[PDB]
RNA sequence: AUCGAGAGGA
């Protein structure tokens, strides 16, 4: 079983007006590339930003790209829960998730713990540990 | 000036000398009780407060002024003697003084009509006393003295008389106070959760014990502390509001000392956002003021509720005056710290079994609890007293008011039964203190004067609390714990082990405002993050901003002997910036060398001034005055780093540490009484080592020199004790060599016959015959006659066949006129020593006369005649019994090497040597190999040589200037093989045995444990009343049981008819009538032969029912249930 | 400690955008917007033809594919009530505290050569 | 803590029920015999005890 | 990205909460006690390090130097003032049990300069 | 359901006080207070007091 | 042994130590040193055992399988060996010592346990103060297990 | 004698 959390470097919550003209400079240029295609409207999206910092590699580890998280969400939360990612070849692996239609600052942290511990990205649930070996007897 | 290496080995020994010259073996014991009286009592008294009565009149009674004077005995006349220890023994009295109070009481009406009137010393008590504490009569005294009183004077004391009984505390491990612990339990709805059992330092009160936990996983952290007389939790900013810190800042200042922090911050952040909605202090009163005194109170009350318990109720040690709630804040605020240190994984969880976080309660500490209930009990009484007097508004008599019973009575009947606590409390009250004194040998006595016990409860399987903790090291002996159900539980000092008395901190709080010091109260909040906290005896006092050369000072005043005590702790945590002092008592500590840059301060004028200690009176004392020596604790140990030797300090290719700060005196003191007794500890399997620290204190010897007048009810004296050839240097101290358990044996270890297989002994019947662990045992019999009433009264006379009913068979023509045997008259079992006779209300007067102990065929030592505290004759009969070593009988060496005796063969049965030794026993080599005890053969070796020579060995544990090669090269210098080995021949035939057997002179120990006491047999004896049962025990000639495993193992056997004998017809064989129609035991009248039973109204329908007496007993207890168990035979 | 790992992504999605562009997105094995990426030549059309005839399919299927008072059930009905409902139950938040009881488990071994 | 209060106006043992509406953040305390009733803000920390605090503040404010 | 402060207010001392403004669609930091507003410079709100890469250099204080119970080396001088001892210790927190690390810290007074190899 | 002597013995002492059973002192209690209690509600008697 | 022990805790202390799976850090240094210091017991035990001559009594009570075996023998002669509590080495139970004798975080094979001596040559009192601590280990599980295997 | 307690033994 692997959780968010066993794959996550780090969260954050940021406060983003503007998907085109984001907080972080790092992430100016994915950002962009998603959003003048207007598949999923810039009017919807919630000023409220959640940004999480994947590790590599802890995904290589599962063999798991940020497409199966991103499915993975997409579909524990449907469409009530937006998030994008950029592609496997930047130094940091990074994907946002701010929510697209108790304040939103705290209930997306309440989104992100429930994100964090129990949803189910692979492996079957209460099956912690697994280690493979020859057995010599 | 530097002591070198070659003399270092008599240079720390002669050190250790003048320790035990100074403190001796009991004198934890003595200094707790010392403390005390000359503290504790006068504390107590002082701390109740005065009773204020009136209708009008009104009186105060202070209580001022505590005198205690001399043990003294008050006959029936009353003329007041000095009672001394041996006639409390005798005559079964309780060794106590009176405690006399000065109270005063004024009369104050009206108009300023105010007078004083002062009762000197009104009679408030009677205190036992510990003997040979200040308070003893055999204080001061000499040798001479005490033998001149029939006194040892070997005994160490330490222990109280009550009803003659020698009674001796226990000290009890218990958890630290004012100490904030924070632990994690796994199983449970905290994360982590910090406590402190804060406690007033005069003991005014009981410790009122604070926890602020961590709710388990907005879901972030909640914490809420636990206030004491508070029905349910609180959030822990409403506590600070209640302090009147009412903004979010102020209270995180107390809180978090560094705001940069982060992590701090995020986490104390839940609570801050829980209690949001209360913003002002008198709210948060109000809130707290509800849970607690009653669900309607007026708000202005529930206000002053809030309040009381604030100030008083929450961490009294930090303060109980008013204006404290700064220090209390900023304690609280520390508690809160801690526990976010903890739960974010910077500070370690407090771990429970370190000693650095526990306390020993001494008898000093243990009287004190009894004396605060029993003194609170006794001014109760005495306002009752007084009220009923004023209500009917005549004048009352302080004296008849004070009904001193009370203090006497608890006192003598907790320390006799040892149910601690008020004797109406008998479940509620832990028992376990105050045993009676083991009086078996002498190192019995000094273990159990030695003994500390960890309350956890025997029941509790979690080996935890019951391993050998790291931090025992020097503190509690690594062997001498019992094997049995509380392993590990019961511990035992180590030799140079001190437990703190307690002190005043005053002088220490006064120099710290000297020095660099500032208040809690004084400083800013901003202040605390890179500065030092100064905690005294957990009360944090105040911040400092350079700890080292606090540190400095305050070591090198305590050094001094200046304002410091010795026994005060000052631990300097650095990575954290406290540094916490601590006074209190029962903090377990230990002498250690200081050490310079590296370089003892012990330098050759100390040891020479010690060599001369006799002369010019240069001590111990002397030596901790010097600087030389200091008292560490066991928490003051973890700051410590510690040269084994002076060796470790010299030198080296590669240093280790090169920063030591103290040297041991002697590794070997990390033993205790018992243990210190093995030679070569260090070559046995440690299991053997505690099994012999346990059978060390079942060894015969002299128990105790003034034998001769003690009346105890078991004693045992080996005829010949012998000091070890081969000894430790430690025994010097414990007097082993003045009063030894056993005997120097010419042991073989040997296969000779198949008599000591499995461990078991062949001894030789000649040296049996020529004294060779012979003992006298000594059982004494008790008896008084009770003039209760005229309805009935004993008296001791001889009975006669033609007055007295209750007459065994047995001849009474051995006792007196008096009904009493003389000595030096020879009796057997069921025979009588004491002739009492008890007024009837065959005639006038039946039997009930004292017997013998069956079956044990001794003769009268001595008589003794009396009278008891409330004044009729007593009587004391020593019977005296010649115990022969024989089949059966116990022996043991020092390294756990047990074993009973197989056979005794004669001197030309036993093999013999060239030269004609025959070895006094024979071990069976098998018990060697898996024990692992190389100690009794390098112990067997090291005695040879010693006997060769004109020696006493040195077994001293840790000694490299003794080794196996260097005994034989010794050995081999005497013409002997060098390895101990002899060629044996054997005793039958006289050839050679082909293996040369390993033989020489070892210590053996006869222990208690003789086959004659064991011995017991039963067929048709006497019965249980209850069930009709074979009684229990060899005493009342009880039956063996018969279990429940018994009774599977004959299942498995498939024995029906032998299962049924065992479990029916020997036991409890019984009938029964039934009724048939409802199966109820009905109403047999078999001498008419009438039968019927009430139910059914049949009198020809009833069964005969053959059943134990234990099922129609179970069967008649489940009617009395109403429950119908009907035995259908149909 | 086998957990290898590497990063090549040649291949890119390559599909037609609305303004005239092909997609850039270097997705391992979905590009979010077009689904799963095929491999397509220098224009955008895909290499296989049978992969080409499924996807113009999928795409002509998704082609094909008191009134004056408030609405209570405007409040029922929207994604923050939804994922309210979903994160605040009562199974879901138990999972939650759960696991982060492991967390503090692993905060508790983490002193290991000590007693406790 | 007890749930059930004597009331303040006729005495009767337990007798005063709590009603803690926390979703308009109010708590109602009404007494079963004599009926009388009261009415106080309450919080998430409140507790009948606190209402019940409340309705003897007022009544003793009251009575002044 | 590192951590973010809880600020207080400036007229009850109370801890600010965040909050949004629609109307200048700007994040501020708002109490719920009084009615203060600040505008933020930071419009980040939370940060959870689940790696938790914590630079324990920061958790270690320069007074360790003088701990006689800590093992010192002439082998690694320090590069602040090139003292020649120093004392070194492993990591032992938590989220640090990993990896035996070792801490170095130069025990010349007034210096404590501390590092790791 | 009173138990006979046997499952309560009222065993003798070293004198002639008869010390009696557990069983016996708890029926000694049942029986004073079923005594009183009988005299009550044969009387009148509080409805509290008799409860 | 102890200066392969000194190996592995330099590689550990300059992170020249890497993981084995299925284990952390702090475990595989545990497991190498462990495994360091049973190939030194067991060395040394047969190297004692090989020394015996079959005049030698305790080969004598061995081979009969009467008492005895051949770990007893590699004890008295050889090496006592590592000494353990709960499975492990010698806990921490002071400040990162185990005793006040070692500098802090003293991983070496004396600090946490391990008796270099035999029965015949004497234990020192560190070793002796461990080794006590492994035979209450025995005593407590001897004292415990008794009432709940017969229950 | 009963009850409890404690200390021990295997
Ligand atoms: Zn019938
Ligand atoms: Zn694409
Ligand atoms: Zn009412
Ligand atoms: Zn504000
Ligand atoms: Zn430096």
Known sequence: HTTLRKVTANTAIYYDPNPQSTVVAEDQEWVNVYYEMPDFDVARISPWLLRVELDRKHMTDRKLTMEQIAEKINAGFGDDLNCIFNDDNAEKLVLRIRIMNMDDDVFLRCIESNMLTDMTLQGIEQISKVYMHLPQT | DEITPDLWQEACWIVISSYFDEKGLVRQQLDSFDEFIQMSVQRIVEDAPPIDLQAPPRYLLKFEQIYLSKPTHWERDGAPSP?????????????????????????????????????????????????????????????????????????????????????????????????????????????????????????????????????????????????????????????????????????????????????????????????????????????????????????????????????????????????????????????????????????????????????????????????????????????????????????????????????????????????????????????????????????????????????????????????????????????????????????????????????????????????????????????????????????????????????????????????????????????????????????????????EKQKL??????????????????????????????????????????????????????????????????????????????????????????????????????????????????????????????????????????????????????????????????????????????????????????????????????????????????????????????????????????????????????????????????????????????????????????????????????????????????????????????????????????????????????????????????????????????????????????????????????????????????????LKHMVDDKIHSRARGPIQILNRQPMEGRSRDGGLRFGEMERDCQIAHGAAQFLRERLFEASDPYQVHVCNLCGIMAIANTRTHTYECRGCRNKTQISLVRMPYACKLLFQELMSMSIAPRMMSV | TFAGKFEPVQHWCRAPRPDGRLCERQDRLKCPFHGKIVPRDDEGRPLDPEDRAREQRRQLQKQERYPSLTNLKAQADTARARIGRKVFAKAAVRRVVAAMNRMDQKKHEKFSNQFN | LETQFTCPFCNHEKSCDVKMDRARNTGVISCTVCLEEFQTPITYLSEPVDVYSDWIDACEAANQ | PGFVGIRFCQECNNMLYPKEDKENRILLYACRNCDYQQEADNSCIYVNKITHEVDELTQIIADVSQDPTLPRTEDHPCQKCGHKEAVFFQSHSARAEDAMRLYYVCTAPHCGHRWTE | PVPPLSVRPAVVMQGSARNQDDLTHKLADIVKINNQLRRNEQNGAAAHVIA | AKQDVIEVIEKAHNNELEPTPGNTLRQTFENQVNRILNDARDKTGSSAQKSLSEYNNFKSMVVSGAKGSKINISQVIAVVGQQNVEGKRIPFGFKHRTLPHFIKDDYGPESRGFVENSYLAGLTPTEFFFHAMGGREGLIDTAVKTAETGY
């Not at chain 2, 003034?706 to 078991?714: A, E, G, I, Q, S």
């Open chain 2, 601 to 1006: 301060l012990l330098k050759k004028r100390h040891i020479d001034q010690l060599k001369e200690r006799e002369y010019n009176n240069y001590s111990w004392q002397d030596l901790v005055a010097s600087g030389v020596v200091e008292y560490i604790d066991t928490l003051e140990e973890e700051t410590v780093m510690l040269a084994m030797t002076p060796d470790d300090l010299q030198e080296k290719e590669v240093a280790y540490c090169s920063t030591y700060t103290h040297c041991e005196i002697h590794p070997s003191m990390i033993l205790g009484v018992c243990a210190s007794i093995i030679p070569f500890p260090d070559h046995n399997q440690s299991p053997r080592n505690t099994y012999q620290s346990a059978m060390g204190k079942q060894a015969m010897g002299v128990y105790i020199t003034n034998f001769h007048v003690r009346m105890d009810t078991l004693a045992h004296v080996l005829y010949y004790p012998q000091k070890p050839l081969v000894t430790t240097r430690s025994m010097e101290y414990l007097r082993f060599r003045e009063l030894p358990a056993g005997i120097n044996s010419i042991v073989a270890i040997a296969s000779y016959t198949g008599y000591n297989q499995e461990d078991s002994v062949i001894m030789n019947r000649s040296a049996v015959d020529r004294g060779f662990f012979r003992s006298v045992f000594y059982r004494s019999y008790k008896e008084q006659e009770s003039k209760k009433g005229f309805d009935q009264e004993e008296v001791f006379e001889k009975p006669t066949r033609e007055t007295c009913q209750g007459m065994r068979h047995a001849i009474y023509d051995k006792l007196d006129d008096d009904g009493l045997i003389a000595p030096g008259v020879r009796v057997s079992g069921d025979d009588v020593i004491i002739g009492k006779t008890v007024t009837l209300p065959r005639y006038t007067k039946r039997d009930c006369s004292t017997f013998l102990r069956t079956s044990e065929t001794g003769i009268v030592d001595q008589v003794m005649v009396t009278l008891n505290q409330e004044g009729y004759k007593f009587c004391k009969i020593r019977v005296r019994s010649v115990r022969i070593p024989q089949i059966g009988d116990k022996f043991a060496s020092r390294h756990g090497q047990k074993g009973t005796c197989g056979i005794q063969y004669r001197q030309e049965d036993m093999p013999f040597t060239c030269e004609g030794i025959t070895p006094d026993i024979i071990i069976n080599p098998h018990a060697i190999p898996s024990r692992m005890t190389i100690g009794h053969l390098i112990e067997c070796l090291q005695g040879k040589v010693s006997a060769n020579k004109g020696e006493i060995g040195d077994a001293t544990p840790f000694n490299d200037a003794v080794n196996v090669q260097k005994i034989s090269n010794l050995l081999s210098d005497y013409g002997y093989h060098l390895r101990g080995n002899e060629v044996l021949y054997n005793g039958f035939t006289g050839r050679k045995i082909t293996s040369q057997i390993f033989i020489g002179p070892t210590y053996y120990q006869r």
């Open chain 2, 83 to 595: 009672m001394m220890p041996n006639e409390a023994r005798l005559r079964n009295l309780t060794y106590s003084a009176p405690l006399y109070v000065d109270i005063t009481k004024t009369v104050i009406k009206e108009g300023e009509e105010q007078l004083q009137t002062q009762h000197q010393k009104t009679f408030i008590g009677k205190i036992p006393i510990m003997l040979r504490s200040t308070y003893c009569l055999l204080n001061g005294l000499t040798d001479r003295d005490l033998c001149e009183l029939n006194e040892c004077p070997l005994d160490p004391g330490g222990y109280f008389i009550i009803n003659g009984s020698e009674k001796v505390l226990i000290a009890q491990e218990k958890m630290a106070t004012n100490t904030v612990y924070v632990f994690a339990k796994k199983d449970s709805k905290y994360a982590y959760t910090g406590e402190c059992r804060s406690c007033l330092e005069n003991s005014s009160r009981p410790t009122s014990t604070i926890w602020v936990s961590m709710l388990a996983r907005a879901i972030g952290q909640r914490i809420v502390a636990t206030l004491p007389y508070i029905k349910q939790e609180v959030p822990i900013i409403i506590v600070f509001r209640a302090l009147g810190f009412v903004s979010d800042r102020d209270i995180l200042e107390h809180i978090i000392y560094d705001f940069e922090d982060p992590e701090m911050m995020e986490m104390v952040k839940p609570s801050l956002d829980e209690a949001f909605v209360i913003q002002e202090q008198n709210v948060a009163l109000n809130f707290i003021g509800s849970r607690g005194a009653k669900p309607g109170v007026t708000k202005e009350k529930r206000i002053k509720y809030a309040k009381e318990v604030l100030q008083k109720e929450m961490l009294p040690h930090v303060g109980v005056s008013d204006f404290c709630e700064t220090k209390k804040a900023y304690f609280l605020g520390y508690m809160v710290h801690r526990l976010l240190l903890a739960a974010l994984g910077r500070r370690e969880l407090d771990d429970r079994d370190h000693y650095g976080n526990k306390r020993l309660d001494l008898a000093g500490p243990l009287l004190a609890f009894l004396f605060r209930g029993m003194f609170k009990n006794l001014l109760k009484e005495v306002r009752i007293y007084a009220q009923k007097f004023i209500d009917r508004g005549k004048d009352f008599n302080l004296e008849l008011a004070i009904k001193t019973r009370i203090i006497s009575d608890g006192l003598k009947y907790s320390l006799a039964t040892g149910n601690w606590g008020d004797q109406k409390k008998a479940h509620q009250a832990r028992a376990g203190v105050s045993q009676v004194l083991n009086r078996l040998t002498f190192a019995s006595t000094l273990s159990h004067l030695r003994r500390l016990n960890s309350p956890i409860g025997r029941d509790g399987k979690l080996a935890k609390p019951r391993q050998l903790h790291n931090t025992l090291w020097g503190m509690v002996c690594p062997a001498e714990t019992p094997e049995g159900h509380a392993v590990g539980l019961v511990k035992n000092l180590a030799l140079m082990a001190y437990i703190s008395v307690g002190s005043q901190p005053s002088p220490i709080l006064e120099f710290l405002e000297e020095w660099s010091m500032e208040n809690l109260e004084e400083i800013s909040p901003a202040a605390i993050a890179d500065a030092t906290k100064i905690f005294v005896n957990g009360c944090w006092v105040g911040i400092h901003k350079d700890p080292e050369q606090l540190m400095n000072t305050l070591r090198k005043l305590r050094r001094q002997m200046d304002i410091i005590v010795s026994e005060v702790s000052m631990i300097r945590d650095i990575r954290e910036r406290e540094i916490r002092i601590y006074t209190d008592a029962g903090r377990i500590c230990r002498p250690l060398l200081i050490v």
